[PDB]
């Protein structure tokens, strides 16, 4: 029955490539080492053809390098501060959902040009002093076009159709599953284009690269209150990408990010490789040579 | 098991010959194809102006200099005002196509230098900030038929390292080895069709990695010519022509 | 009321826990999946793509010139052209590589590496280079006679402008920590030194200096272990 399915659920190890035993090759016309990098093809030279190799039955597992295992890890995608003290006596915050505000998730995602994934959003909410009193919060997903709340009391919080999570700060972090929500067949971290037609002659070309296919709306968070609580709440949002398809691998960003929704670097271009003294300098003392 | 150095690319009424080729790159192993009914979303019949749009358009020649930093184009943009392609790309809202990009740079056996010719899908151009200066202008994002000189080829004008641009479909033009670079690129997008004016599906970078060095008496004007051919151009959404 | 007993680990949010979670949208059917060229499923497939080594990562050199290994006609014999270590997670030339940047998302690595050197001189420029990989234990070889005792290739410039130096997996452990330095030089892969086997010989009216472009990649037996956070880009404030 289904016991066969449950048995084949553990991750079976897939091993790296074995090395075959090789011998010396003295001849002409067989040049496994001469390549042509101009072809855009990487070298197909094997260690069995450059050196005399032994037979290694390689049992190293290559599973952890999957796109799933690389990406199915919850990282901080949003820090929301529900301000209800001082000058900002709001008790609610409407947060634009963007997973590009923090370096670790953003850099990992931009390894890919297109990604199609579901997500497991977790909300870690606490006070300034790390404490978690019983405080009912509402976590309303406001999809693009839905009325956004303008107060802690406004009618939008009735969440008749919007998905809302109600949880106290004392409860374990609210965690939900988000599907692949996009008019496109994949999210697009790099959109070489403009969302609208026009001349695009504005002094601030703010719309370059802004694909509305990634704009998935706003997370509207409030404390379920009747007046100012006097407490600021820090909600931290962690996305765990799952069921992930990645397309068009890209270079991992080498320059420090500056803004959220734009590739933009400082004129002080940092070298992708740390500098050394000369092209003949290495940082390795090694052992004492037996006969220099 | 060899790659022949001579090659002839023939599409439409255009034929490109090379005698120093370097094994044409088929981007991501996938030839350009028309949109399968399974992946199509628009319901209008697409136009397929096969021979009038799928053909080699020679579009720009850039003089390679010793201090040259490189140039980039955007594939639909570089053809949006050229031939029956540009007219189909203006009259139609939806467009999809692959391309065969043939970059031509020949020099003597006494010149040296290597060019990195790469086809970058979704080549979002960055602005270098020391606000209005935070985003690149339309001339840098869509340079057109002329292309744009690289400001910082090291970071590809995108913040990403040039040394990893070989993750994209690329060839080299090493002057001692080859005088051309051919990249066949299918249609890459999260959408089956898209606007040829709003969206640039691929960037077309030609960056000198090893600089052009010659001696006194050698031809100083070593040009780089970009010839691109749409492949399987479909156009839907016929309306008034928009530039 | 089925009798249960909560064990330690209840209410914890382990960020790497692959568990179920309640769907926010019942009945949601996503946009149909269409074919997009270029799907990658493994980061090992990306580590096998040859990317340029920044071997000229020297103080003063800027830009694309950091990618070039200068090679010129020598007045002496058996001189060192360039050297670099082959620890893919070490600060240095491998930082500019896809393999060296995907390694830094992992704690331990294993497998043969590969540097593809492309000569970018004139067709009339001839030469022969000895590119030696020195296994651990020895510092950078001081002479070519000492370097040729290790895994090396003699590279003849010609119509095939590129050569591959397969850095073989020569390790005591099955895996090597990506972290190097200190006691973690227990995992130092070694040094690669480029030597002039013969001279860089050019005819008259031909440039006497040229450039080797190194291309670092991984072999088919390359492996990565223990996903970790990379040390590449830092952040002090949220980006908008």
């Amino acid at each position, epitope marked *: 029955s289904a016991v066969s399915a449950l048995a084949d659920t553990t991750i079976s190890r897939v091993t790296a490539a074995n090395t075959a035993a090789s011998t010396h090759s003295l001849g002409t016309g067989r040049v496994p080492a001469l390549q042509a990098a101009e072809t855009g093809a990487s070298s197909n030279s094997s260690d069995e053809n450059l050196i005399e190799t032994r037979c290694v039955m390689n049992r190293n597992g290559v599973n952890e390098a999957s796109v799933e295992h690389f990406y199915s890890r919850a990282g901080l995608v949003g820090v929301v501060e529900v301000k209800d003290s001082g000058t900002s006596l709001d008790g609610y915050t409407v947060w634009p959902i963007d997973v590009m505000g923090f370096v670790q998730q953003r850099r990992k995602l931009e390894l890919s040009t297109y990604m199609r994934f579901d997500a497991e959003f977790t909300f870690v909410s606490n006070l300034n002093n790390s404490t978690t009193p019983g405080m009912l919060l509402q976590y309303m997903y406001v999809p693009p076009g839905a009325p956004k709340p303008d107060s802690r009391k406004s009618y939008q919080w009735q969440t008749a159709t919007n998905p809302s999570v109600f949880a106290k700060l004392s409860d374990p972090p609210p965690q939900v599953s988000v599907p692949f929500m996009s008019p496109a067949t994949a999210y697009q971290w790099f959109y070489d284009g403009y969302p609208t037609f026009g001349e695009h002659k504005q002094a601030t070309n703010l719309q370059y690269g802004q694909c509305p296919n990634n704009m998935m709306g706003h997370f509207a968070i409030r404390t379920v209150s009747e007046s100012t609580t006097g407490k600021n709440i820090h909600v931290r949002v962690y996305m765990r990408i799952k069921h992930v398809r990645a397309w068009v691998p890209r270079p991992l960003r080498s320059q420090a990010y500056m803004v959220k929704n734009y590739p933009t670097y400082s004129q002080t271009i940092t070298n992708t490789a740390t500098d050394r003294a000369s092209i003949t*300098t290495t940082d390795y003392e090694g052992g004492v040579p037996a006969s220099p | 098991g060899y790659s022949d150095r001579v090659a002839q690319l023939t599409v439409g009424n255009s034929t490109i010959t090379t005698q120093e080729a370097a094994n044409i790159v088929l981007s991501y192993g996938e030839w350009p194809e028309y949109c399968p009914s399974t992946d199509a979303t628009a319901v209008d019949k697409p136009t397929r102006p096969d021979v009038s749009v799928n053909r080699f358009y020679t579009l720009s020649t850039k003089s390679w200099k010793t201090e040259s930093t490189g140039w980039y184009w955007k594939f639909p943009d570089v053809l949006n005002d050229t031939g029956v392609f540009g007219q189909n790309a203006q009259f139609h809202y939806l467009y999809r196509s692959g391309f065969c990009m043939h970059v031509q740079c020949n020099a003597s056996k006494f010149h040296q230098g290597a060019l990195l010719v790469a086809a970058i899908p979704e080549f979002v151009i960055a602005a270098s900030s020391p606000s209005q200066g935070l985003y690149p202008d339309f001339a840098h994002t869509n340079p057109g038929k002329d292309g744009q000189e690289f400001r910082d080829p090291y970071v590809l004008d995108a913040g990403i390292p040039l040394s990893q641009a070989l993750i994209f479909p690329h060839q080299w033009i090493n002057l001692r080895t080859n005088n051309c670079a051919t990249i066949i690129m299918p249609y890459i997008n999260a959408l089956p069709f898209d606007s040829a004016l709003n969206h640039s599906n691929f960037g077309l970078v030609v960056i000198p990695i090893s600089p052009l060095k010659y001696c006194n008496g050698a031809t100083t004007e070593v040009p780089i010519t970009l010839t691109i051919a749409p492949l399987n151009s479909e156009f839907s959404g016929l309306r008034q022509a928009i530039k | 009321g089925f009798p249960t007993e909560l064990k330690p680990g209840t209410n914890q949010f382990l960020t790497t826990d692959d568990g179920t979670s309640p769907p926010i949208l019942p009945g949601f059917e996503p946009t149909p999946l269409i074919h997009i060229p270029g799907e990658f499923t493994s980061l090992l497939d990306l580590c096998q793509v040859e990317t340029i080594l920044e071997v000229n990562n020297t103080t003063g050199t800027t830009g694309v010139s950091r990618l070039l290994i200068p090679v010129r006609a020598q007045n002496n014999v058996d001189q060192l052209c360039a050297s670099f270590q082959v620890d893919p997670g070490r600060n240095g030339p491998w930082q500019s590589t896809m393999v060296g940047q995907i390694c830094r998302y992992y704690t331990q690595w294993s497998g043969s590496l590969k540097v593809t050197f492309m000569f970018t001189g004139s067709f009339m420029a001839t030469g022969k280079m000895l590119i030696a990989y020195t296994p651990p234990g020895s510092a950078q070889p001081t002479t070519r006679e000492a370097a040729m005792l290790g895994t090396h290739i003699v590279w003849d410039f010609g119509l095939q402008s590129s050569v591959t130096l397969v850095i073989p997996w020569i390790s005591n452990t099955h895996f090597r920590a990506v972290k190097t330095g200190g006691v973690y030089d227990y995992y130092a892969t070694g040094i690669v030194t480029i030597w002039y086997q013969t001279n860089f010989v050019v005819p008259p009216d031909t440039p006497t200096e040229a450039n080797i472009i190194a291309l670092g990649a991984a072999q088919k037996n390359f492996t990565l272990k223990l996903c970790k956070d990379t040390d590449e880009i830092q952040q002090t404030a949220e980006y908008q």
Partner: antibody
Amino acid sequence: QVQLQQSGAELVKPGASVKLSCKASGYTFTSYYMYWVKQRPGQGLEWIGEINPSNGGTNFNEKFKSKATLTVDKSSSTAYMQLSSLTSEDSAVYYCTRYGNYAYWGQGTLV
Amino acid sequence: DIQMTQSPASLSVSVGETVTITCRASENIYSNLAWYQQKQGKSPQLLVYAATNLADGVPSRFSGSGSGTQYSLKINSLQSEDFGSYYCQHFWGTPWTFGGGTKL
């Protein structure tokens, strides 16, 4: 070879500014930083600052930030240093140094 | 700012002796040291780059060695023209602190 030709000697009245030149030759100018070193006669060498001939990025010492301005003419392959607020402690020999893999120095400029 | 500390501030030896200058550093400069020989009147001539690479034209009598914090320049078979001032110079980071100097 890699020759850095600095400007001629300078004799400027106090409270002024002089534009010292450094016409690089023999290498790609936009590929190496240009550094300036100050040496009062008898005293040692003092590093003024750097300039990248690709973005104008200049990093001076804490004792020369408001006393030296570095520019570059990428078309002319020439670097410049215009010492502002000239004094007596600013009368010295000035060199332009490129390092890369080999420290190349100019000839100097008496100021 | 990684500052320098050149140990021998002055030295006077005869032709044939072997003088060894020392150039410490505040922090590890990673072989980013250059020794110069400047005789008053001429321009600073580079002797050893990267703390070990003998510059072009410099006689094999000169030798640079060291790693990390401590570095040493040795002049074996001290010929006649080996007089003047000897400056070490770190080129690791922002300050680019030169050496104090060594009269010889």
